[PDB]
Ligand SMILES: Cc1cc2nc3c(=O)[nH]c(=O)nc-3n(C[C@H](O)[C@H](O)[C@H](O)COP(=O)(O)OP(=O)(O)OC[C@H]3O[C@@H](n4cnc5c(N)ncnc54)[C@H](O)[C@@H]3O)c2cc1C
């Protein structure tokens with residue numbers, strides 16, 4: 001019942017943690033609430049679900065063989081593919097033996113005299129760890145919205161967060177979709193291809209970009225695999241964790257012609273990268289207007305009915321303020337005779353009856369309702385953990401006025417505690433396989449450092465967190481990601497906004513310097 005590291009979660013981050021700590025000779029025990037490895041990719045399995053970073057980038061670089069040996073089937077892999085891949089990773093590196101599945105971590109309590117963490121689960125486990133590494137991910141489910149009389153609907157209610165493992169037939173059914181986030185936009189066209197009729201109930205609209213999904217050319221598949229090393233070097237030094245430089249010059253500084261060209265070129269790349277076409281695109285609100293504009297045009301081009309195309313246009317929001325969804329023929333979907341878009345602003349949902357949905361305006365006879373839900377606060381997962389630091393102070397208490405960290409990897413009161421890709425670090429703002437690799441590596445080096453010098457622990461200092469808090473406030477003030485209605489907010493912008501490569505530089509030079517900002521503890 002005692003281990004060197006206790007890891008929470010078995011997705012991209014957790015699985016790499018197990019591998020990395022073990023190679024260094026640490027003993028690991030990992031807990032996963034799910035039944036299998038894969039994290040978001042295991043549980044989030046609705047039709048059409050895929051990543052929005054190129055799969056060649058969005059994958060592990062730690063194992064040169066895996067890199068060579070694994071063939072991605074398309075540009076943006078779907079969840080069953082990414083799932084197969086991670087299960088392959090777990091296969092290859094014998095990871096499962098140190099995971100306990102179906103087990104939810106409930107509390108973690110610091111012993112201050114010993115600098116150990118007693119960790120407890122909902123399955124009755126009680127284990128002692130030198131280091132607690134939480135790798136619980138940035139995305140947890142948003143709540144299921146209370147709909148009056150949902151309990152009376154006689155047909156089928158399918159949740160995108162809990163999709164049936166053996167599929168759902170929409171053939172011949174009248175289907176209603178509530179929600180138009182990634183879950184919605186990704187599944188809608190698939191539902192639409194086989195449903196009898198599809199009604200899409202829209203509260204607000206969000207920006208999505210055509211995936212432009214091509215399967216990779218054989219002759220390029222080996223040519224990329226030869227240039228992997230140089231592709232990884234670029235992404236690590238980059239800003240988003242991908243091998244992509246933004247435009248040299250500013251948005252408005254370059255001619256109207258030369259802007260429509262770059263905007264078009266980045267439109268091919270898709271979604272995430274499109275918000276990073278011009279340097280000031282997520283800084284200068286006039287420059288962002290030019291993007292909104294380029295986007296609006298493309299949508300009126302593809303949607304037949306202006307009334308509908310107007311409804312599909314996100315109204316009075318900044319583009320890239322919330323991450324752009326990547327889709328496969330989503331807007332096209334609305335040109336079909338069997339799909340209708342319903343304006344929830346015009347006629348809100350007042351509840352459900354036996355036969356379907358009730359808006360103020362009409363009733364909808366439906367056989368099936370798909371709740372296409374969204375995602376809770378960046379912290380999210382961690383809120384459901386009970387983490388008791390020094391003084392018997394709780395992490396929730398400590399973060400009462402917003403998250404406070406040093407580099408994201410330090411919090412005073414919480415020695416030997418490491419939260420993986422969350423507040424204080426680039427987080428969801430960079431490729432997260434690479435971000436997970438960076439953080440695990442950093443923790444691993446820190447443990448090694450301690451182990452060398454004969455020291456008991458590492459702990460963020462009061463002084464260091466406040467500076468980092470200040471710093472995170474300052475990188476953010478400029479950004480159009482710093483809206484009032486932005487997901488990135490606590491109570492406080494949560495991610496570090498300065499760029500991945502820069503962030504990597506910082507935490508690296510911190511290690512090299514003997515962990516300045518942290519206290520080293522003897523215990
Ligand atoms: C549709 C979609 C597309 C995406 N595309 C991209 C992309 O292209 N690029 C990118 O960088 N990111 C993308 N993301 C973000 C994605 O959330 C992360 O890339 C990925 O989830 C990070 O892996 P992780 O291990 O850090 O966290 P997760 O995959 O979320 O895994 C965390 C695991 O920890 C477990 N856990 C949490 N709390 C507990 C507890 N108390 N006890 C036990 N287990 C627990 C959870 O069960 C989960 O299995 C996408 C997300 C979605 C939903």
Ligand SMILES: NC(=O)c1ccc[n+]([C@@H]2O[C@H](COP(=O)([O-])OP(=O)(O)OC[C@H]3O[C@@H](n4cnc5c(N)ncnc54)[C@H](OP(=O)(O)O)[C@@H]3O)[C@@H](O)[C@H]2O)c1
Nearest residue numbers: 145178179180181182183203204322323373374375428487
């Ligand atoms: N690669 C990545 O790292 C990645 C990928 C995707 C997303 N993200 C991040 O995660 C966040 C969430 O993503 P998401 O778009 O899936 O979630 P979301 O924005 O909550 O999308 C869910 C949709 O359901 C709707 N909805 C919610 N409650 C409703 C109700 N009662 N009735 C009708 N409709 C309702 C929402 O509109 P209303 O809110 O107007 O009701 C929204 O259109 C984003 O902010 C983004 O920053 C990151």
